[PDB]
Design a protein around this ligand. Structure first.
Ligand SMILES: CN1CCC(n2nc(-c3cccc(Oc4ccccc4)c3)c3c(N)ncnc32)CC1
Ligand SMILES: CN1CCC(n2nc(-c3cccc(Oc4ccccc4)c3)c3c(N)ncnc32)CC1
Ligand SMILES: CN1CCC(n2nc(-c3cccc(Oc4ccccc4)c3)c3c(N)ncnc32)CC1
Ligand SMILES: [Mg+2]
Lengths: 221, 216
C-alpha cells in the first residue's frame, strides 16, 4: 500500500545527488554578507485536462520530506540533530497517510538532451500513462521555486488529453521503487478540492486549478 | 540592493535554515531512504491597496537565485569548494541577476506568534502596512518543495488603504516595496523578463479572477 509506512527513522545526510549545501559570500552596498543555500535541479510540471471525462489529471504519492515535516509539526523535536551513528527511529511515527500529497505530474530537469517539454511528456507517460507530443503542450508559467533556499526554476505546462491517449499503466517506474496513483479530478469538484485544507497539495495544484478554471474552461463552455 | 561585489562560493557545514537529513522507511516491505532538508514553515501576504488600486509586492536580492543564474550562465561555477576558503566567482554576474519580485513573506521560526501574526509582522516591517490578524483571509495552504523540504506555506489576502500605511517598511538593519497597478497586473505576471515566484503569479491570477470582477 502507498500509505503503509513502517520503521520510519531519521538519520544524517552527508552527501546526496539531490541537495548540496553551499554558502554565498558577497558584499552588498559595502557590507560583507553570507547566505546559506542548496544547489538543486530545475523542474517541470504539467497539468492535463482529460476532455473525455471533463477531469483534471493529478498524481498522488508518498513524499518522505512531507511526512517528516508533518511528524515534526505534530511532535516538535522529531527532527532534532542526529547526534549518533545511524538512523534514529521516530517515537512516535505518524501513519504514512501523513506524507501522501496530491501534485501535478512533475519531474526534475536531469535528462541530458531532453527539452523541458520532452521531460514533461516523459513524466506524463511514466506517471500517468498519457501519451503526449511536445507540441501538444502550452507553457503556462516559468518561475523560481524556493527563492530563500535554492535557485531552481520550474516551468509549468498544460495540455488537453482524451481517454484514447491514456494508453499506458502509469504509476511510475516499478523497478525504481515508485508507487504513484493517478487522480482524475472532476471539474465540478475541482475548486472545492483545491480550497480544502485537509488534502495536502502543492501550490502548483492550487494554481493549476485556479488558472484552468479562469483561463481555459470558459473557452470550452 | 543590486550592487553586489566579490561574490564567492564557500562551504556550509551548519546552518539554522537548512539541515540535511535522510528519512529511512519501509514501504511495501522494501527498505527505502530519502534525502531532504529540515526547514521552517512560512507565511505570505497579498495586499490590495484600494486607495491606489494596486497590489503590494516586494523586491529584493536573493543570493540563492543569484547563484542559480551564475551556474546557468557558467556551468561548474558552483562545484564543491575544495579549498581553505571561499572561491571567487570569476566570471560573476551583476547583482540584478538575483533580484526578485515576491509576495511579502516570512518564516515561522519564532515562538509567540501565530501564522496570522507573523504575516502582520512581515507586512509592517517589509511593506509599512499596519494589519490586524482579523483583517486577514486565508487564501491557500500548501506544501512548497515536496521533493526536498516538505515545509508548509500559508498565503493570506487582505485589503488595505493608505490609512494603514503608517510606516516606511523596507526591512530591518534592503527590501523595496512595489505597488503594482491593477491594470498592468496580468502583463506584469506574464512578463518572463521579471524574475518572480509562483506565489506572485498565483496571487495576481487569483486576485484578477476572484476579487477584481466584483469590485466597484
Ligand atoms: C495528441 N497526440 C498525441 C500523440 C500523437 N503522437 N505524438 C507522438 C510523439 C512524437 C514525438 C515525441 C513524443 O513524446 C516523447 C517521445 C520521447 C521522449 C519524450 C517525449 C510523442 C507520436 C508518435 N511518435 N507516434 C504516433 N503518434 C504520436 C500526436 C498528438
Ligand atoms: C532577516 N535576517 C537576515 C537574513 C537572514 N536569513 N534568512 C534566510 C532565509 C532562509 C530561508 C528562507 C528565506 O526567505 C524566505 C522566507 C519566507 C518565504 C520565502 C523565502 C530566508 C537566510 C539564509 N538561507 N541564509 C543566511 N541567512 C538568512 C535571516 C534573518
Ligand atoms: C527513481 N526516482 C525516484 C526518486 C529518487 N529520488 N528523487 C528525489 C528527489 C529530489 C528532488 C525532488 C524530487 O521530486 C520532485 C521533482 C520535481 C518536482 C517536485 C518534486 C525528488 C530523491 C531524494 N530527494 N532523495 C532520495 N532519492 C530521491 C531517484 C529517482
Ligand atoms: Mg515526479
Amino acid at each position: 500500500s502507498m500509505e503503509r509506512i513502517e520503521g520510519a527513522s531519521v538519520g544524517r545526510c552527508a552527501a546526496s545527488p539531490y541537495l548540496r549545501p553551499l554558502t554565498l559570500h558577497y558584499r552588498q552596498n559595502g557590507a560583507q554578507k553570507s547566505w546559506d543555500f542548496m544547489k538543486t535541479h530545475d523542474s517541470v510540471t504539467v497539468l492535463l485536462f482529460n476532455s473525455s471525462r471533463r477531469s483534471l489529471v493529478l498524481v498522488k504519492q508518498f513524499r518522505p520530506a512531507v511526512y517528516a515535516g508533518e511528524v515534526e509539526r505534530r511532535f516538535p523535536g522529531s527532527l532534532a540533530a542526529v547526534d549518533q551513528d545511524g538512523p534514529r527511529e521516530l517515537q512516535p511515527a505518524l501513519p504514512g497517510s501523513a506524507g501522501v500529497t496530491v501534485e501535478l505530474c512533475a519531474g526534475l530537469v536531469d535528462q541530458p538532451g531532453l527539452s523541458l517539454e520532452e521531460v514533461a511528456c516523459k513524466e506524463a507517460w511514466e506517471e500517468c500513462g498519457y501519451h503526449l507530443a511536445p507540441s501538444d503542450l502550452r507553457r503556462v508559467a516559468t518561475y523560481w521555486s524556493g527563492v530563500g533556499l535554492t535557485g531552481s526554476r520550474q516551468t509549468m505546462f498544460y495540455t488537453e488529453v482524451t481517454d484514447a491517449q491514456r494508453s499506458g499503466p502509469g504509476g511510475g517506474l516499478v523497478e525504481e521503487g515508485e508507487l504513484i496513483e493517478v487522480v482524475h479530478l472532476p471539474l465540478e469538484g475541482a475548486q472545492a478540492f483545491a480550497d480544502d485544507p485537509d488534502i495536502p497539495k502543492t501550490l502548483g495544484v492550487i494554481f493549476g486549478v485556479s488558472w484552468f478554471l479562469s483561463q481555459v474552461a470558459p473557452n470550452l463552455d
